[PDB]
């Protein structure tokens, strides 16, 4: 498997579902100076999808993407 | 350079077994019997 | 008034020898100190934790320094099988010439002690090869010790004292500890194995001077970034590899061989590297679960409030438990001790059966010492967990704030819990003792065929499920036609099945009726110890006998001879009783482990299989038979290197017996006796010129229990340690 | 409304924009004065170090900057320890448009120096040497190539 | 009320009379809590609808002659190629997982937000059989009864295959050939002491 | 010094006062019980903590309670 299509595809899929499908569900579930949300990560995205969400759904995509590459690499392996 | 001299045990064993305990007991004894103002 | 102790004005005004004793005993009970505030309490604990850390690293520095300075590590690595590790040198002016000669062993110039801690096998497995390696590690850990000691001082200073809210940020601490303290540390240890330990086991030196120019794998990170992760599993070390040399060595760095290295009879270094890499990923991910300053993750309070069964079977469920746990340091410490206490036992059970360190299995004394060492520590830690659970109920528990939740409902059926624990303990005691006694009588009358020998089929069935073909059950990993056997047949089953079907190691030892009886003895010990500790916790706040017990605190002498008599009614006394049972239980566990390995190591498992079904067999064949070399360490005809253990053996018996004095004879007798001595001193010329500053008194009721238990416990431990080491090393040394 | 490190992002309250080079960048909330001085001193050293590495290579000084360490060194350290102590202590005691340009150039140097270190380990090439390789073959020579050809880099 | 599962008994009070498929069967009183019953009502229909498709798919494959339901995915493990009505499907296992996870998450995510709606109608009822909502009671009873039967049938497929290893149609032919000598009582598995 | 408390369940039977070996307790007028007297603990600096008073109390649960406290020469019962 080519790493670019697999990792890009999985990342694209997980960003889409996080923005169009489960964004509403996550927001409903989601809803001394080192413990306060001092910086509000404001975004111009119409649906409220901000950088923190991008890191989260993007991280899942990368993790799932490498799992596909790792599992496939085993097939045809020697001494393993 | 880390190796201590061959005579170190002859000094440190008496030092930590007789001398330092004697000082510690004497120091502690005076402290625990000291009267507060 | 006396200054000491500064933290208790009530003690400082005590005019008797009580004050010094209680000044020491109450020193670390911060909550009871004069003027203590919640915020100051947390800051004091934080500084103390830095003190513990520096002590631990200094202790590790000392062990590294003395082995490098006085050990034979460099000689040991050339022939670990036939050389005894040296712990440190002896310098004792009380020795006679014969003792100097006797303890001169292992190739050292002068008298030395033989190490039983297994640090040699551990340091050798991780890549240490020369005394210079040990020296540098020693200096590094001393520096780390100093830094932690300084950090403890620093965070006590006015501008570096964390606020109370900082200490109560559960979500943030869990995130960092799971991903950083657990995950990154595990990831970093993987790097050491890949970059240093694995190359060293293949005859290549990798150190700080060249580790940036040596490739851990012939393909450097190319497989990692392209997803071809199987490139790292190719060409593992062969079955003929000689540890520490390049002969028969491979190139893989991440494998799943799943057995033992044939020469060292320990876990593969490439399996231990892949283990920590996978654990690191799991923990790093787990550390992104809880909410912090970034608007994602879980709030722990929200999770707890949600988990309430709809039927009302748990009442209010977990409502209010976030504040209960978060506001109680004793609830937290109870949880920490219970978790670490169980983990310590897991370490003991897994390290003997799946030895991770090279040449650990063949060092019989080290194997025995390590299992016994960690199981006793686990036993003490478990008692503490329940002790602080009982302290929680008194000091911290608030019935109003836990109304109807699971915690308050445990108190609602405490009689049901205690009475069922009582039934289980009675059943196990009656029938386990009964069966042993029946077998002793059958043995005594010369009819061993009439004894009751119940096969442990349930446990043998589990062993068969894991691939042990001895019992013929033949299913799961024991059945060659099962899906479980087939699916893993290319990953780890070949190595695992080879190891589990070899009866010369400790991986799922064969078991029989003798193993059946002793396992029910262990269950008797666990249940009875839990009964005493649980009863102590659940009755800590009150009973029908003492309804207002919570008004008297965790530890107090008694409530007097009234109402029938109330000796040992406090929750503290329940813990005191429980320690005796913990020692008895661990004693049964370790006796079992030791005797079963002694007969395996001697090639005669039949002796255990035939003698362990009755108690005279344990007395005659385990204790009496294996004491012979120990008690001859010195005698009228001379002495040998076991004289120290012979002396310590009796030393242990003496301390043990001295403890019986404090446990059996109680205070009033001694207080009257001391008064006659007070009279005598004042009436004696030339001696009444000297006088005391603290009026002598007998030890207090509570203090006698603790001191007596301490003597009992120390003598218990020392006696067995001497017997364990001397009987094993003398046999195999 | 000053420019912000993220489009349409409200600057944090604890950063009022008074300090030089204040882009309202503090997601972790560490800034909730000493750090401002700390940024300059770390930045100032980075600028001197970055200039030295680039300058030394251009003049042909050898060996590589990371190999420069290899008067005896054992005798230099006591001198440097004593010499630098007085300057730092006196500097600390005094503390106890140009500004914006100083910080921005200082920040660039700090990021630049880390590039030198990571590039050396990953590429074994000095900053000018690495730059020339990229210009000659941009697509061919980049992080993707070097990360996937470490054996060749260390095969010399 | 649909009927009585145990003639002569009394319906539990927590099962309303107008609930489709209400035979008064709740011996463990799982639906005693009204909030729990609401979730169970939705879940039963969903399980029945999937089971009805699953049983039809399992039977259709074996009747048409493309193996049994159990052997359908073996191509993805033996290096084979996917087929459908004998038509080769170019996709491989990894591609199929991607399509299914994305598609089902989108469709199931949409249904979840609806808030436990079990009879959407509208776009899901193009022919408008239940559009009236007056006669829908009879149809809802038919759906739940056929759905319950399908759920029981599918468990019969899994259980029967685990015992004899044959496909449901093959097992039926085996029973018909020798009804008294080929049944659950003669597997040697279901009843150990026979 | 130990802490001795009398609770409003006292019936004024006087048995705790009669049993005290240190003369810590005494009876005072009261109106809350039929006997019109309640136990009192005026001299607690002399209490040794023997709890003979608690042994003598008939009420259930106790009406006189001793909480052992800081130790002095008097409370320890020393004659030296
Ligand atoms: C800003 C301060 C500073 C920095 C970043 C470095 C950085 C470095 N010095 Mg150091 N030095 C620094 C100040 C100084 N160095 C030296 C004297 C040396 C020497 C003599 C050497 C280094 C070397 C090194 C390198 C060690 C790499 C390694 O893992 O070697 C692992 C190997 C060992 C630790 C041995 C590394 C690039 C070494 C080098 O060139 O490595 C390539 C080296 O030989 N430094 C002195 C004089 C006292 C300094 C004074 O400030
Ligand atoms: C001052 C910034 C800077 C510049 C102009 C360059 C320029 C170059 N780098 Mg270098 N590099 C830098 C910083 C920089 N680097 C840093 C900080 C690191 C460590 C992460 C590296 C690590 C690195 C490697 C490993 C390699 C290069 C390489 C290269 C060359 C090809 C470009 C490439 O493939 O980059 C790809 C990789 C990068 C890291 C480029 C990053 C560029 C962006 C603009 C950096 C933005 C940083 C950001 C503001 C930090 C935010 C922090 C956050 C906490 C807020 C080229 C000469 C390649 C080469 O051929 O070297 C000889 C090569 O192999 N660089
Ligand atoms: C697959 C779906 C998807 C994804 C993953 C994103 C992701 C993102 N969008 Mg969004 N966007 C989407 C669909 C999506 N969008 C659609 C369908 C539209 C309508 C045309 C928009 C219109 C839109 C706008 C107008 C903006 C974003 C922005 C952003 C970014 C905000 C991050 C930030 O600054 O946090 C803090 C982020 C990368 C903002 C941004 O800064 O993008 C770079 C922004 O300005 N989006
Ligand atoms: C907690 C760790 C620890 C422990 C339990 C021991 C234990 C022992 N050491 Mg060792 N030692 C340690 C750390 C430790 N050492 C360290 C870190 C150093 C390097 C500074 C030394 C240096 C050292 C020397 C030079 C000698 C011993 C010796 C001894 C023995 C007698 C006690 C003595 O003289 O202590 C002395 C302890 C010190 C000088 C260091 C104490 C450091 C902490 C911070 C206090 C005894 C086996 C003696 C020996 O081998 O007799 C045969 C001996 O001569 N030790
Ligand atoms: C780690 C602690 C430690 C150490 C280092 C020693 C050391 C010694 N013990 Mg032991 N001892 C210890 C603990 C220790 N003991 C404990 C805890 C106990 C109680 C259980 C005992 C009980 C004990 C007994 C009963 C005896 C010893 C004796 C000895 C000596 C044996 C060698 C010999 O033949 O000396 C022969 C004596 C000499 C060569 C004289 C050495 C110098 C003397 C002791 C001091 C001189 C001081 C000087 C005049 C003025 C101060 C000088 C100073 C400032 C430098 C030696 C000095 C024997 C002995 O001789 O004791 C005096 C002896 O009989 N010990
Ligand atoms: C993380 C571990 C941990 C921590 C932080 C604490 C902390 C605390 N415990 Mg807990 N505890 C723990 C583990 C822990 N415990 C364990 C493992 C047990 C089971 C053994 C207990 C059992 C326990 C009890 C039963 C009690 C506490 C109490 C306390 C409090 C006061 C401690 C004190 O003043 O001790 C002072 C300590 C001493 C004076 C020293 C005691 C020494 C013992 C007896 C061993 C002596 C060995 C001997 C010297 C060896 C000689 C060898 C020879 C060869 C020379 C404090 C909050 C007390 C309390 O009031 O809590 C509210 C209390 O009653 N703990
Ligand atoms: C070898 C010594 C010993 C023995 C046998 C026991 C036995 C018992 N202890 Mg005890 N205990 C001991 C030492 C011992 N303890 C010590 C040293 C301490 C520390 C102070 C404690 C502290 C302690 C606590 C705190 C608790 C126990 C409990 C128990 C019971 C555990 C359950 C059990 O075994 O039921 C089966 C019973 C037995 C095995 C007892 C022996 C029964 C014999 C064989 C009957 C023989 C009858 C026969 C006809 C002969 C009669 C002759 C006669 C008429 C002349 C049991 C009665 C727990 C308990 O009560 O649980 C309900 C409990 O809470 N023990
Ligand atoms: C703070 C920054 C810094 C530091 C720590 C160093 C450190 C060093 N420089 Mg460098 N250098 C710097 C900035 C710095 N330089 C700058 C800004 C320039 C101007 C472009 C130079 C130009 C320069 C030259 C021309 C040479 C050094 C050399 C040296 C070495 C000897 C320096 C000495 O004798 O004193 C040493 C590794 C010498 C060297 O590499 O010797 C092997 C050398 O020949 N440096
Ligand atoms: C009193 C109290 C307390 C205390 C407590 C304690 C001390 C406890 C302990 C406890 C314990 C100590 C417990 C334990 C448990 C355990 C468990 C529960 C386990 C489980 C396991 C499992 C489940 C497993 C499984 C498996 C197997 C077996 C094999 C294969 C694999 C697997 C994984 C599957 C506290 C503090 C809370 C407070 C309150 C009060
Ligand atoms: C082989 C078969 C495999 C089957 C795998 C099934 C995986 C299921 C994962 C579900 C993850 C959560 O996803 C699901 O969460 C909620 C239901 O719980 C739904 O969301 C809804 O749930 C709440 C509780 O019922 C409702 O009150 C709200 O309308 C809404 O929040 C989401 O729209 C849905 O996406
Ligand atoms: C919804 C439920 C629908 C049920 C449809 C049942 C259709 C039954 C078709 C015939 C079954 C018997 O036919 C079977 O007998 C043979 C006996 O050797 C089996 O062999 C074959 O699998 C098949 O030919
Ligand atoms: S405890 Fe003893 S001395 Fe004190 S009041 Fe009661 S009876 Fe009197």
UniProtKB/Swiss-Prot annotation, chain A:
GO biological process: photosynthesis
Residues of the full protein shown: 32 to 126 of 126
Function: Not yet known.
Bilayer-crossing regions: 5-25, 51-71
Gene coding for it: PSAG
Record-given protein name: Photosystem I reaction center subunit V, chloroplastic
Organism for this UniProt entry: Chlamydomonas reinhardtii (Chlamydomonas smithii)
Example of a GO cellular component annotation carried by this entry: photosystem I
Keyword Transmembrane helix assigned: yes
Keywords of the record: Chloroplast, Membrane, Photosynthesis, Photosystem I, Plastid, Thylakoid, Transit peptide, Transmembrane, Transmembrane helix
Subcellular location(s) per record: Plastid, Chloroplast thylakoid membrane
Family according to the record: Belongs to the PsaG/PsaK family.
Membrane topology classification: Multi-pass membrane protein
Curated annotation (Swiss-Prot), chain C:
NCBIfam families: psaB
First-tier enzyme category under EC: oxidoreductase
Originating species: Chlamydomonas reinhardtii (Chlamydomonas smithii)
Membrane topology: Multi-pass membrane protein
Residues reported to bind phylloquinone: 670
Catalytic activity from the UniProt record: reduced [plastocyanin] + hnu + oxidized [2Fe-2S]-[ferredoxin] = oxidized [plastocyanin] + reduced [2Fe-2S]-[ferredoxin]
HAMAP family: PSI_PsaB
Annotated family: Belongs to the PsaA/PsaB family.
Positions that bind chlorophyll a B1: 653
This protein's name: Photosystem I P700 chlorophyll a apoprotein A2
E.C. number: 1.97.1.12
One Gene Ontology term of the molecular function aspect: 4 iron, 4 sulfur cluster binding
Annotated compartments: Plastid, Chloroplast thylakoid membrane
Biological processes annotated in GO: photosynthesis
Parts of the chain that traverse the membrane: 45-68, 134-157, 174-198, 272-290, 329-352, 368-394, 416-438, 516-534, 574-595, 642-664, 706-726
UniProt keyword annotations, A-Z: 4Fe-4S, Chlorophyll, Chloroplast, Chromophore, Electron transport, Iron, Iron-sulfur, Magnesium, Membrane, Metal-binding, Oxidoreductase, Photosynthesis, Photosystem I, Plastid, Thylakoid, Transmembrane, Transmembrane helix, Transport
Taxonomic lineage of the native organism: Eukaryota, Viridiplantae, Chlorophyta, core chlorophytes, Chlorophyceae
Bound cofactor: record note: P700 is a chlorophyll a/chlorophyll a' dimer, A0 is one or more chlorophyll a, A1 is one or both phylloquinones and FX is a shared 4Fe-4S iron-sulfur center.
GO cellular component: chloroplast thylakoid membrane; photosystem I
Residues that coordinate or bind [4Fe-4S] cluster: 558, 567
Coiled-coil segments on the chain, per record: none
Pfam families in the record: PsaA_PsaB
UniProtKB/Swiss-Prot annotation, chain F:
Pfam family, one: Fer4_7
Domain called 4Fe-4S ferredoxin-type: residue spans: 1-30, 38-67
One GO MF term attached to the UniProt entry: metal ion binding
EC class of the enzyme, as a word: oxidoreductase
Cofactor(s) this protein requires: [4Fe-4S] cluster
UniProt membrane topology term: Peripheral membrane protein
Cystine pairs: none
Keywords: 4Fe-4S, Chloroplast, Electron transport, Iron, Iron-sulfur, Membrane, Metal-binding, Oxidoreductase, Photosynthesis, Photosystem I, Plastid, Repeat, Thylakoid, Transport
Entry note: cofactor: Binds 2 [4Fe-4S] clusters. Cluster 2 is most probably the spectroscopically characterized electron acceptor FA and cluster 1 is most probably FB.
Gene Ontology terms: cellular component: chloroplast thylakoid membrane; photosystem I
Residues the record lists as binding [4Fe-4S] cluster 1: 10, 13, 16, 57
Gene Ontology BP terms: photosynthesis; photosynthetic electron transport in photosystem I
Keyword Metal-binding: yes
S-adenosyl-L-methionine in keyword set: no
Chain residues that bind [4Fe-4S] cluster 2: 20, 47, 50, 53
UniProt EC number: 1.97.1.12
Outcome of mutating residue 11 to V: 60-fold increase in affinity of PSI for ferredoxin. Unable to grow photoautotrophically
Location in the cell: Plastid, Chloroplast thylakoid membrane
Role: Apoprotein for the two 4Fe-4S centers FA and FB of photosystem I (PSI); essential for photochemical activity. FB is the terminal electron acceptor of PSI, donating electrons to ferredoxin. The C-terminus interacts with PsaA/B/D and helps assemble the protein into the PSI complex. Required for binding of PsaD and PsaE to PSI. PSI is a plastocyanin/cytochrome c6-ferredoxin oxidoreductase, converting photonic excitation into a charge separation, which transfers an electron from the donor P700 chlorophyll pair to the spectroscopically characterized acceptors A0, A1, FX, FA and FB in turn.
PANTHER family referenced in this protein's UniProt entry, alphabetically: PHOTOSYSTEM I IRON-SULFUR CENTER, PHOTOSYSTEM I IRON-SULFUR CENTER-RELATED
NCBIfam families per UniProt: PS_I_psaC (TIGR03048)
Subunit structure: The eukaryotic PSI reaction center is composed of at least 11 subunits.
Protein name (record): Photosystem I iron-sulfur center
């Amino acid at each position: 498997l080519d790493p670019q299509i697999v990792i890009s595809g999985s990342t694209a899929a997980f960003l889409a579902i996080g923005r169009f499908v489960f964004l509403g569900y996550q927001r409903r579930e989601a809803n001394d100076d080192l413990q306060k949300n001092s910086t509000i990560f404001a975004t111009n995205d119409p649906a409220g999808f901000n950088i923190i969400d991008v890191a989260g759904w993007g991280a899942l995509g990368h993790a799932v993407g490498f799992a596909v590459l790792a599992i496939n690499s085993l097939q045809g392996a020697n001494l393993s | 350079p880390f190796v201590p001299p061959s005579w170190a045990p002859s000094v440190f064993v008496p030092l930590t077994g007789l001398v330092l305990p004697a000082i510690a007991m004497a120091t502690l004894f005076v402290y625990i019997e000291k009267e507060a103002p | 008034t006396k200054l000491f102790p500064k933290f208790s004005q009530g003690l400082a005004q005590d005019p008797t020898t009580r004050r010094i004793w209680y000044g020491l005993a109450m020193a670390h009970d911060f909550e009871s100190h004069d003027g203590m505030t919640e915020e100051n309490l947390y800051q004091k604990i934080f500084a103390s934790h830095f003190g513990q850390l520096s002590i631990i690293f200094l202790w590790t520095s000392g062990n590294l320094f003395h082995v490098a300075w006085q050990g034979n590590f460099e000689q040991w690595v050339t022939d670990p099988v036939h050389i005894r590790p040296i712990a440190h040198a002896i310098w004792d002016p009380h020795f006679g010439q014969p003792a100097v000669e006797a303890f001169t062993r292992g190739g050292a110039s002068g008298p030395v002690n033989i190490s039983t801690s297994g640090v040699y096998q551990w340091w050798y497995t991780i890549g240490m090869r020369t005394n210079q390696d040990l020296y540098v590690g020693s200096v590094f850990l001393a520096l780390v010790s100093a830094i932690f000691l300084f950090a403890g001082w620093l965070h006590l200073q006015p501008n570096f004292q964390p606020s109370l809210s900082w200490f109560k940020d559960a979500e943030s601490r869990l995130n960092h500890h799971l991903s950083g303290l657990f995950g990154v540390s595990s990831l970093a240890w993987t790097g050491h194995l890949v970059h240093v330990a694995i190359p060293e086991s293949r005859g290549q030196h990798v150190g700080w001077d060249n580790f940036l120019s040596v490739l851990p794998h012939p393909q450097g990170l190319t497989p990692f970034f392209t997803g071809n992760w199987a490139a790292y599993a190719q060409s593992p070390d062969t079955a003929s590899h000689v540890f520490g040399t390049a002969q028969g060595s491979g190139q893989a760095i991440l494998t799943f061989l799943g057995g033992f290295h044939p020469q060292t009879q320990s876990l593969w270094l490439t399996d231990m590297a892949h283990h920590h890499l996978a654990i690191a990923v799991i923990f790093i991910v787990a550390g992104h679960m809880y909410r912090t300053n970034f608007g994602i993750g879980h709030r722990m309070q929200a999770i707890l409030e949600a988990h309430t069964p709809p039927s009302g079977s748990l009442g209010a469920g977990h409502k209010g438990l976030f504040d209960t746990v978060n506001n109680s340091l004793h609830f937290q410490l109870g949880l920490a001790l219970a978790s670490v206490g169980t983990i310590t036992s897991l370490v003991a059970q897994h390290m003997y059966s799946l030895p991770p360190y090279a040449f650990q299995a063949i060092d019989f004394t080290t194997q025995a010492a390590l299992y016994t060492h960690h199981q006793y520590i686990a036993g003490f830690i478990m008692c503490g967990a329940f002790a602080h659970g009982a302290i929680f109920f008194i000091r911290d528990y608030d019935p109003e704030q836990n109304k109807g939740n699971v915690l308050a409902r445990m108190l609602d059926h405490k009689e049901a819990l205690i009475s069922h624990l009582s039934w289980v303990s009675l059943f196990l005691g009656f029938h386990t003792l009964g069966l042993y006694v029946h077998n002793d009588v059958m043995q005594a009358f010369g009819t061993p065929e009439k004894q009751i020998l119940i096969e442990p089929v349930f446990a043998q069935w589990i062993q068969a499920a894991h691939g042990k073909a001895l019992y013929g059950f033949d299913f799961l990993l024991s059945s060659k036609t099962s899906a479980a056997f087939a699916n893993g047949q290319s990953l780890w089953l070949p190595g695992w099945l080879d190891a589990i079907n070899n009866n010369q190691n400790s991986l799922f030892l064969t078991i029989g009726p003798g193993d059946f009886l002793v396992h029910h003895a262990i269950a008797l010990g666990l249940h009875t110890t839990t009964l005493i500790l649980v009863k102590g916790a659940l009755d800590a706040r009150g009973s029908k006998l003492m309804p207002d017990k919570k008004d008297f605190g965790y530890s107090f002498p008694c409530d007097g001879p009234g109402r029938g008599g109330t000796c040992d009614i406090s929750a503290y006394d329940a813990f005191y009783l429980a320690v005796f049972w913990m020692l008895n239980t661990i004693g049964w566990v370790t006796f079992y482990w030791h005797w079963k390995h002694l007969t395996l190591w001697q090639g005669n498992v039949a002796q255990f299989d035939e003698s362990s079904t009755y108690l005279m067999g344990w007395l005659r064949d385990y204790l009496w038979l294996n004491s012979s070399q120990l008690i001859n360490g010195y005698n009228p005809f001379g002495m040998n290197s076991l004289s120290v253990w012979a002396w310590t053996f009796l030393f242990g018996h003496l301390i043990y017996a001295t403890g019986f004095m404090f446990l059996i004879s109680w205070r009033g007798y001694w207080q009257e006796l001391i008064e006659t001595l007070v009279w005598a001193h004042e009436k004696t010329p030339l001696a009444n010129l000297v006088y005391w500053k603290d009026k002598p008194v007998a030890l207090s009721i509570v203090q006698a229990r603790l001191v007596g238990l301490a003597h009992f416990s120390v003598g218990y431990i020392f006696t067995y340690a001497a017997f364990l080491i001397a009987s094993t090393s003398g046999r195999f040394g | 409304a000053r420019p912000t490190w993220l489009p349409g992002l409200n600057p944090p309250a604890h950063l009022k924009g008074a300090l030089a080079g204040d882009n309202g960048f503090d997601p972790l909330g560490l800034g909730q004065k000493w750090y401002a001085e700390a940024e300059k001193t770390n930045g100032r050293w980075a600028m001197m170090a970055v200039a030295g590495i680039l300058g030394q290579e251009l003049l042909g000084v050898t060996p590589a900057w990371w190999e420069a360490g290899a008067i005896p060194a054992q005798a230099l350290t006591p001198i440097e320890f004593i010499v630098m102590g007085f300057l730092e202590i006196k500097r600390y005691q005094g503390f106890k448009s140009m500004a914006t340009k100083e910080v921005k150039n200082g920040r660039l140097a700090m990021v630049a120096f880390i590039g030198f270190c990571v590039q050396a380990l990953a590429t074994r090439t000095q900053p000018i040497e690495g730059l020339t390789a990229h210009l000659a073959d941009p697509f061919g020579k980049n992080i993707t190539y070097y990360l996937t050809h470490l054996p060749e880099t260390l095969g010399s | 009320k649909a009927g009585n599962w145990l003639p002569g008994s009394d319906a539990p009070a927590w099962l309303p009379d107008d609930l489709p498929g209400n035979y008064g069967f709740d011996p463990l009183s799982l639906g005693k809590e009204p909030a729990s019953l609401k979730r169970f009502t939705e879940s039963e229909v969903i399980h029945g609808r999937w089971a009805m498709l699953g049983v039809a798919g399992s039977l259709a494959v074996e009747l048409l002659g493309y193996g049994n339901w159990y052997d359908a995915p073996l191509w993805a493990v033996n290096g084979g190629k996917a087929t459908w009505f004998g038509i080769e499907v170019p996709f491989d296992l990894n591609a199929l997982l991607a399509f299914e996870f994305v598609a089902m998450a989108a469709a199931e995510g949409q249904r979840g937000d609806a808030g436990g709606v079990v009879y959407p109608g509208g776009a899901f009822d193009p022919l408008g059989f239940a559009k009236d909502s007056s006669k829908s009671g009879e149809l809802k009873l038919k759906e739940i009864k056929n759905g319950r039967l399908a759920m029981v049938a599918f468990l019969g497929f899994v259980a029967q295959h685990a015992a004899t290893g044959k496909g449901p149609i093959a097992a039926l032919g085996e029973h018909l050939a020798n009804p008294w000598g080929a049944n659950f009582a003669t597997n040697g598995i279901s009843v150990p002491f026979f | 010094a130990h802490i001795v408390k009398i609770y409003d369940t006292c019936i004024g039977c006087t048995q705790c006062v009669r049993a005290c070996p240190l003369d810590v307790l005494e009876m005072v007028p009261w109106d809350g019980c039929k006997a019109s007297q309640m136990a009192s603990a005026p001299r607690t600096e002399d209490c040794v903590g023997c709890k003979r008073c608690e042994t003598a109390c008939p009420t259930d649960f106790l009406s006189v309670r001793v909480y052992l406290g800081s130790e002095s020469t008097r409370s320890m019962g020393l004659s030296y």
